[PDB]
Amino acid sequence: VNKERTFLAVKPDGVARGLVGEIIARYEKKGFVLVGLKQLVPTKDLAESHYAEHKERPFFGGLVSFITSGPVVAMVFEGKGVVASARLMIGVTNPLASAPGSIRGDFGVDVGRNIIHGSDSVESANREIALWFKPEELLTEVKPNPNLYE
Amino acid sequence: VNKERTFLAVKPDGVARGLVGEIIARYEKKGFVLVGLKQLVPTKDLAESHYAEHKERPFFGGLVSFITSGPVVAMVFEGKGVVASARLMIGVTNPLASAPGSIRGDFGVDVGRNIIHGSDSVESANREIALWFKPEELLTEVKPNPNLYE
Amino acid sequence: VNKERTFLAVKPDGVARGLVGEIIARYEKKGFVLVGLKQLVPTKDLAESHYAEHKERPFFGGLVSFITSGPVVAMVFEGKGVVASARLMIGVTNPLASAPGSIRGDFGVDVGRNIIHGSDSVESANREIALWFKPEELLTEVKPNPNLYE
Amino acid sequence: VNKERTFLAVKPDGVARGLVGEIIARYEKKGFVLVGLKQLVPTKDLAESHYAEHKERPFFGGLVSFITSGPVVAMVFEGKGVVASARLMIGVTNPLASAPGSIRGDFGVDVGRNIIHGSDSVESANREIALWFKPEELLTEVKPNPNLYE
Amino acid sequence: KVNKERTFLAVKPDGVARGLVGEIIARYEKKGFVLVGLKQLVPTKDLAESHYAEHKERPFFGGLVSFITSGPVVAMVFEGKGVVASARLMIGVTNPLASAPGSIRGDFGVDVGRNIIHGSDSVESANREIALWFKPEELLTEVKPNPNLYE
Amino acid sequence: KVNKERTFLAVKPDGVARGLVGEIIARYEKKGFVLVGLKQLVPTKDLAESHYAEHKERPFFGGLVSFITSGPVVAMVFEGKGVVASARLMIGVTNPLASAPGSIRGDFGVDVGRNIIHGSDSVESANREIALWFKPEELLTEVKPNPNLYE
Ligand SMILES: [BH3-][P@@+](O)(OC[C@H]1O[C@@H](n2cc(C)c(=O)[nH]c2=O)C[C@@H]1O)OP(=O)(O)O
Ligand SMILES: [BH3-][P@@+](O)(OC[C@H]1O[C@@H](n2cc(C)c(=O)[nH]c2=O)C[C@@H]1O)OP(=O)(O)O
Ligand SMILES: [BH3-][P@@+](O)(OC[C@H]1O[C@@H](n2cc(C)c(=O)[nH]c2=O)C[C@@H]1O)OP(=O)(O)O
Ligand SMILES: [BH3-][P@@+](O)(OC[C@H]1O[C@@H](n2cc(C)c(=O)[nH]c2=O)C[C@@H]1O)OP(=O)(O)O
Ligand SMILES: [BH3-][P@@+](O)(OC[C@H]1O[C@@H](n2cc(C)c(=O)[nH]c2=O)C[C@@H]1O)OP(=O)(O)O
Ligand SMILES: [BH3-][P@@+](O)(OC[C@H]1O[C@@H](n2cc(C)c(=O)[nH]c2=O)C[C@@H]1O)OP(=O)(O)O
Ligand SMILES: [Mg+2]
Numbered sequence: 045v046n047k048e049r050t051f052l053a054v055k056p057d058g059v060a061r062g063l064v065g066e067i068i069a070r071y072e073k074k075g076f077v078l079v080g081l082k083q084l085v086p087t088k089d090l091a092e093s094h095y096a097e098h099k100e101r102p103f104f105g106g107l108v109s110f111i112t113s114g115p116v117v118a119m120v121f122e123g124k125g126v127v128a129s130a131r132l133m134i135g136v137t138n139p140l141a142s143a144p145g146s147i148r149g150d151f152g153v154d155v156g157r158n159i160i161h162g163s164d165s166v167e168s169a170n171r172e173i174a175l176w177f178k179p180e181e182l183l184t185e186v187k188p189n190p191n192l193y194e
Numbered sequence: 195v196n197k198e199r200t201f202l203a204v205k206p207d208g209v210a211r212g213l214v215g216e217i218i219a220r221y222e223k224k225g226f227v228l229v230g231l232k233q234l235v236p237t238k239d240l241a242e243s244h245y246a247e248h249k250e251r252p253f254f255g256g257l258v259s260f261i262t263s264g265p266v267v268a269m270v271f272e273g274k275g276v277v278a279s280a281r282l283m284i285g286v287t288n289p290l291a292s293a294p295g296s297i298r299g300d301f302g303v304d305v306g307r308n309i310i311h312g313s314d315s316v317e318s319a320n321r322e323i324a325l326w327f328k329p330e331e332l333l334t335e336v337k338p339n340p341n342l343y344e
Numbered sequence: 345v346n347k348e349r350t351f352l353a354v355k356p357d358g359v360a361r362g363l364v365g366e367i368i369a370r371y372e373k374k375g376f377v378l379v380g381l382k383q384l385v386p387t388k389d390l391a392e393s394h395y396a397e398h399k400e401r402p403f404f405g406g407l408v409s410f411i412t413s414g415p416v417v418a419m420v421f422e423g424k425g426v427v428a429s430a431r432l433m434i435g436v437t438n439p440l441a442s443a444p445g446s447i448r449g450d451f452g453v454d455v456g457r458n459i460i461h462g463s464d465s466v467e468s469a470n471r472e473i474a475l476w477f478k479p480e481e482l483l484t485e486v487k488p489n490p491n492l493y494e
Numbered sequence: 495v496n497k498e499r500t501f502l503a504v505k506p507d508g509v510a511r512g513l514v515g516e517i518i519a520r521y522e523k524k525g526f527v528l529v530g531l532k533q534l535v536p537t538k539d540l541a542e543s544h545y546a547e548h549k550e551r552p553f554f555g556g557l558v559s560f561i562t563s564g565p566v567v568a569m570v571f572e573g574k575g576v577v578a579s580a581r582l583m584i585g586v587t588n589p590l591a592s593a594p595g596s597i598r599g600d601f602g603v604d605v606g607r608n609i610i611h612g613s614d615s616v617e618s619a620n621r622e623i624a625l626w627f628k629p630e631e632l633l634t635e636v637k638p639n640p641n642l643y644e
Numbered sequence: 645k646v647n648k649e650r651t652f653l654a655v656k657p658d659g660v661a662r663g664l665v666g667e668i669i670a671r672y673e674k675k676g677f678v679l680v681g682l683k684q685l686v687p688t689k690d691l692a693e694s695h696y697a698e699h700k701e702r703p704f705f706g707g708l709v710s711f712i713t714s715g716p717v718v719a720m721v722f723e724g725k726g727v728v729a730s731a732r733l734m735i736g737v738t739n740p741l742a743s744a745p746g747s748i749r750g751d752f753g754v755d756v757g758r759n760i761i762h763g764s765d766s767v768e769s770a771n772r773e774i775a776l777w778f779k780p781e782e783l784l785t786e787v788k789p790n791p792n793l794y795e
Numbered sequence: 796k797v798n799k800e801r802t803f804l805a806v807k808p809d810g811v812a813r814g815l816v817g818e819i820i821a822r823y824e825k826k827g828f829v830l831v832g833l834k835q836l837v838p839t840k841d842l843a844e845s846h847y848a849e850h851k852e853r854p855f856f857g858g859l860v861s862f863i864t865s866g867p868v869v870a871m872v873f874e875g876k877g878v879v880a881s882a883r884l885m886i887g888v889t890n891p892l893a894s895a896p897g898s899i900r901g902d903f904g905v906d907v908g909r910n911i912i913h914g915s916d917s918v919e920s921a922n923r924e925i926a927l928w929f930k931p932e933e934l935l936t937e938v939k940p941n942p943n944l945y946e
């Protein structure tokens with residue numbers, strides 16, 4: 045329902061490059077609600093559990109290594125179709141082919157330095173949210189906005 | 195001819211959410227000239243008449259009724275191929291399927307609260323403008339910018 | 345009360361320069377509510393009645409002449425201290441001495457081309473509002489925002 | 495030393511109004527480094543303790559109570575002279591007297607709903623950070639940018 | 645190819661006249677591309693004609709050359725991975741009206757002859773173009789790849 | 796004085812490295828000032844020393860000259876009514892920390908030695924400065940005053 049959630053995270057490059065506010069504002073302006081937020085330096089295990097679906101992929105080692113090389117800003121947004129929309133708002137894997145207007149499109153040039161992570165399905169979203177957030181960090185008081193929802 | 199015009203209106207949600215300036219600014223930046231502007235609390239006649247192509251359609255009631263639920267900023271922009279361009283700049287009926295960079299894409303989530311309306315043809319544009327503005331409310335002498343037009 | 349109103353107007357240069365949305369957005373973001381809005385080419389009388397307090401000043405003739413040389417976007421905003429705050433947000437007479445962050449400061453360089461007009465007291469505000477707006481163009485339904493007002 | 499830190503929090507109004515990203519972005523742009531961040535619904539203890547210098551003061555009740563009324567985005571920024579700089583970037587207690595360009599100046603009107611809080615000294619900063627964040631929540635190894643610092 | 649690829653971009657006379665130079669450069673900077681060359685000049689007819697050589701016969705040519713030389717132009721060169729194709733994607737398509745919201749031509753233009761900016765269309769055209777508008781000395785040689793941008 | 800006054804501004808190495816060139820130029824364009832000169836270069840020690848001549852003896856001098864020449868700089872000249880004083884107002888004060896929100900140094904800096912930009916401080920220093928960094932040919936001569944900007 046309009047309660048669907050998604051997990052997003054500003055990777056070390058996004059954080060190091062000062063893009064955290066910019067990214068949060070894009071989702072705030074869109075109408076999505078911030079139900080979880082925190083900065084932390086990812087643990088090797090965290091990183092490996094997060095990207096477990098890519099553990100056989102060659103790039104996994106370097107990916108895990110970079111995701112744990114500095115602070116990360118993890119977050120969860122709520123709203124009608126927020127998982128697929130946040131994905132749209134991010135762009136595509138390769139920042140160079142991400143359309144102007146998306147986050148990777150407007151700001152990135154390297155796949156390994158693609159600024160932000162976004163869950164790709166409600167299934168991976170729920171999976172990833174529990175992975176990064178305990179229940180006491182997620183808001184329950186989500187009063188819908190009559191201005192954004194019919 | 196660089197004289198084409200289109201009707202656009204910021205709905206109660208867009209107005210209530212403070213997006214009038216952001217929206218007007220997007221069209222100014224693009225090169226379009228505002229030849230009519232005014233805020234108002236639309237009448238049932240205006241609303242039902244404006245959306246007169248969706249009489250049988252269900253949502254018609256809530257639609258007609260929402261648009262009359264509060265302040266609406268109506269306007270007419272003039273420019274070369276402004277009708278089609280403005281809808282492109284708007285996005286698609288559904289805000290979630292609206293591409294990043296578009297008005298609906300950047301700011302909404304509900305097809306019910308999709309923030310703005312823009313004519314969909316020159317005929318509907320002419321019909322709509324005739325409906326929202328008296329002729330003395332529209333500018334007449336609009337000089338063709340040497341930087342925008344060849 | 346938090347119902348105090350003020351009159352503002354984007355002069356011909358402001359309009360011609362495509363600054364209308366930018367200006368409206370600055371007041372929308374601040375928390376002030378748009379209770380009246382319209383574009384029109386000022387009549388000589390309108391202009392003279394508006395600036396009647398300066399009718400003896402040398403610059404009056406040229407001022408009246410310019411204010412009637414093109415479209416103007418007239419508006420009224422409502423909120424706690426909106427008259428003095430809009431003034432602050434405009435800057436000072438001379439755009440060159442208006443602080444960065446204000447409207448004239450960020451965008452102007454000539455006194456005669458100082459982009460916008462703002463009422464200077466509640467008295468002149470009420471005076472100017474009736475001057476430019478009939479009662480049926482002013483909103484009465486002003487539901488305060490629990491987010492902006494304690 | 496370029497190691498000074500300050501506590502800042504976006505209040506329920508700023509959060510509810512979608513200003514978290516805009517606010518974080520202002521400090522990022524300035525050159526300050528986020529060394530702590532998290533959203534939460536503050537406890538009465540936290541609120542009353544945080545505003546423990548305004549115990550006798552009247553508004554204390556509503557203050558303590560508003561801050562616990564909904565989600566608050568807390569954070570700690572580090573930089574050279576960040577405590578004084580951040581308050582400057584904030585404005586003044588009163589949003590109407592806050593200069594254009596400042597956070598309060600740009601976005602508020604009510605002293606009650608003045609959107610953000612920022613420490614007012616290094617002592618209050620240290621006291622406040624100790625209060626909102628556990629030490630494991632703050633970054634430790636913060637590299638001094640060659641472009642920002644000499 | 646490599647992270648040192650380069651492309652030639654120019655803010656046409658209309659773009660400079662409308663005050664879009666800073667907006668355009670900011671877009672390329674925010675994206676992570678490095679400015680290795682930059683200068684404002686009023687192009688000569690010979691520079692213009694040589695630059696648009698490929699359209700030497702096409703009918704809109706004369707008017708094009710005339711306009712390009714009718715006022716100041718801001719020329720520049722940006723370097724980064726796949727910058728030629730990326731810069732084009734950011735500009736839009738020939739007609740501003742057909743250009744997507746988010747692209748430069750999409751966000752600010754409405755007429756083909758006043759489409760704000762030019763971007764090289766290939767590494768080869770880019771290398772030729774850079775050569776025509778900049779003497780080697782005007783181009784940066786040292787460029788520390790940013791670790792935040794490139795792996 | 797006149798609507799043709801001019802001033803010399805330069806995006807220091809830190810400003811260029813942080814990607815603030817477009818933001819800064821946009822600010823001056825939005826204000827109504829016209830760009831009559833512009834180019835990116837890595838200053839010579841002699842240009843730097845001559846430019847900051849007035850501080851030739853002051854202790855922070857050596858470090859200053861060293862930094863100004865440690866990377867690319869974007870130099871430019873803007874023209875408009877009272878542009879010298881206006882441009883300074885827009886930059887802020889020497890210390891970025893003391894600079895007002897809204898000013899360039901106020902919005903982006905935090906250290907005096909990394910204060911992003913330089914603006915001439917008088918018509919006389921501006922004329923001298925323009926002369927040192929730009930050959931006459933690089934400067935625009937024709938400038939149609941904009942009727943929307945000037946009465
Ligand atoms: B293909 P994917 O699911 O991979 C996850 C992240 O792994 C990184 N990566 C990926 C690939 C394919 C590579 O070659 N190198 C590399 O560093 C960045 C991806 O975001 O990408 P996405 O984040 O879903 O776009
Ligand atoms: B399909 P359309 O012409 O509909 C007009 C408006 O009616 C509202 N609407 C529409 C449909 C089809 C619906 O299911 N629910 C709903 O609220 C919003 C549309 O803007 O959309 P558009 O606004 O012209 O893009
Ligand atoms: B001194 P004031 O009340 O004058 C009204 C407008 O008149 C114009 N004007 C003023 C003066 C003093 C002048 O020399 N030339 C000129 O064109 C612009 C003012 O906004 O200014 P303000 O708008 O209240 O800042
Ligand atoms: B005077 P101060 O330290 O007060 C703290 C907060 O308390 C709230 N407040 C304050 C006062 C004095 C009042 O009358 N009403 C009110 O709601 C908002 C202040 O941020 O203000 P500041 O936030 O530190 O600038
Ligand atoms: B087809 P192309 O290479 O043309 C070069 C420039 O010529 C101008 N032009 C083009 C065409 C086709 C026309 O009809 N009128 C006109 O003024 C603008 C183009 O950028 O376009 P592009 O710049 O590569 O998008
Ligand atoms: B006092 P001033 O003319 O100095 C010129 C530049 O020298 C640098 N500087 C200055 C001083 C005084 C210092 O302590 N350290 C330092 O790095 C930056 C100034 O822009 O400053 P301004 O640039 O005119 O604000
Ligand atoms: Mg994936």
Ligand SMILES: [Mg+2]
Pocket residue numbers: 314
């Ligand atoms: Mg339709």
Ligand SMILES: [Mg+2]
Pocket residue numbers: 464
């Ligand atoms: Mg006055």
Ligand SMILES: [Mg+2]
Pocket residue numbers: 614
């Ligand atoms: Mg205090």
Ligand SMILES: [Mg+2]
Pocket residue numbers: 765
């Ligand atoms: Mg081509």
Ligand SMILES: [Mg+2]
Pocket residue numbers: 916
């Ligand atoms: Mg000095």
